[PDB]
Paper text:
The five members of the KDM4 subfamily (KDM4A–E) catalyze the removal of the methyl group from tri‐ and dimethylated lysine residue 9 in histone 3 (H3K9me3/me2). Herein, we present the first successful attempt to obtain high‐resolution X‐ray structures of both hydrazide and tetrazole moieties bound to the enzyme KDM4D. All structural work reported herein was performed on the catalytic core of KDM4D, which comprised amino acid residues 1–342. All of the ligands (1–7) reported in this study occupy the native cofactor binding site, which is in close vicinity to the metal binding site and the site binding the methylated histone lysine.
Numbering used by the authors: 11 to 340
């Protein structure tokens, strides 16, 4: 078996290899990449997402989110306080202000150390889940707005025709902006392109070990676990690498830089943080291998994890027994 230690693999496709998206995902899996739960893909030198980022400042962040932490440095939750709208230009200025800018640091490891030491003591502001795309329409390879849809995948594999769409999201981050531990809706894949700016550090648990992370999370967040048997899909809980190591949880870490893609695989728990101002684009997708995962995916029915109406069909078809309960939750 390939990649038995579940290491994060890094791929360097040639321009020819970059033509057929599906084929390359399948290739990465043939090499065991999925075992890690996350892979990095560095595009060929001839590729670009768009010509420049000079003209993005007028994008609106309709509901910036202030990420207010509670707990202890290595075990905390975050809640998202809504703020007044602002443009990307305004957000960038805020990120670079003395209150929010990245501190002086020696390297990525020193910054990681500062993050886990001090994150709770600050409340960075996050632009999240903004429908849109920054890929040029003429970019034919790895254009996250032009992928095959999950609905079409489900139709091709299972013969059922369903409603719903599948479009990308933009994320605008600053120092200490945090994404909590989670797997995707219905344990889908995700793909993530860092368009512009400072790095984004990722942590990931191998899919074969995701239940170990869940068990730890129930111990560390006991009231949340009593409230919902799938509370990680609320996307609020953070656990540091130090705490994961103390508890024997298998995981890996890697830093993504501008111009790089990250793929998360079905049931690969991930979390991470931004180093400074940046802009990313992401979308969920499926392959034939996902179907099994979608059938088995846990669900939040407590009401906290509201999601896209696209999800309805996925639950309805893949998990008919669970559908009426999940729907009440929505
Ligand atoms: N699936 N992709 C993710 O969970 C990353 C979400 C994110 N990327 N930048 N800010 N938030
Ligand atoms: Cl700091
Ligand atoms: Na490892
Ligand atoms: Ni995710
Ligand atoms: Zn819930």
């Amino acid at each position: 078996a390939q990649n038995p230690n579940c290491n994060i693999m890094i791929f360097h496709p040639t321009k020819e290899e970059f033509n057929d998206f599906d084929k390359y995902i399948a290739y990465m899996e043939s090499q065991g990449a999925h075992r890690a739960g996350l892979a990095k893909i560095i595009p060929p030198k001839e590729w670009k997402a768009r010509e420049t980022y000079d003209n993005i400042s007028e994008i609106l962040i309709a509901t910036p989110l202030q990420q207010v932490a509670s707990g202890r440095a290595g075990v905390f939750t975050q809640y998202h306080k809504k703020k007044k709208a602002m443009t990307v230009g305004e957000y960038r200025h805020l990120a670079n202000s003395k209150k929010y800018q990245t501190p002086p640091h020696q390297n990525f490891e020193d910054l990681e150390r500062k993050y886990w030491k001090n994150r709770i003591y600050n409340s960075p502001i996050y632009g999240a889940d903004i429908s849109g795309s920054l890929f040029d329409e003429n970019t034919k390879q790895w254009n996250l707005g032009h992928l095959g849809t999950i609905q079409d995948l489900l139709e091709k594999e299972c013969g059922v025709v369903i409603e719903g769409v599948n479009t990308p999201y933009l994320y605008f981050g600053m120092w200490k902006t945090t994404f909590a531990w989670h797997t995707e809706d219905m344990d889908l894949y995700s793909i993530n392109y860092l368009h512009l700016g400072e790095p984004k550090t990722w942590y990931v648990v191998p899919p074969e070990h995701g239940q170990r992370l869940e068990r730890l999370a129930r111990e560390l967040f006991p009231g949340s676990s009593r409230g919902c048997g799938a509370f990680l899909r609320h996307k609020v809980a953070l656990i540091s690498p130090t705490v994961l190591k103390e508890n024997g949880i298998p995981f890996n870490r890697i830093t993504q830089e501008a111009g790089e893609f990250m793929v998360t695989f079905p049931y690969g728990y991930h979390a991470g943080f931004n180093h400074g101002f940046n802009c990313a684009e992401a979308i969920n997708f499926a392959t034939p291998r996902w179907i099994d995962y979608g059938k088995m995916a846990s669900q939040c029915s407590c009401g906290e994890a509201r999601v896209t109406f696209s999800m309805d069909a996925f639950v309805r078809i893949l998990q008919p027994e669970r559908y009426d309960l999940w729907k009440r939750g929505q």
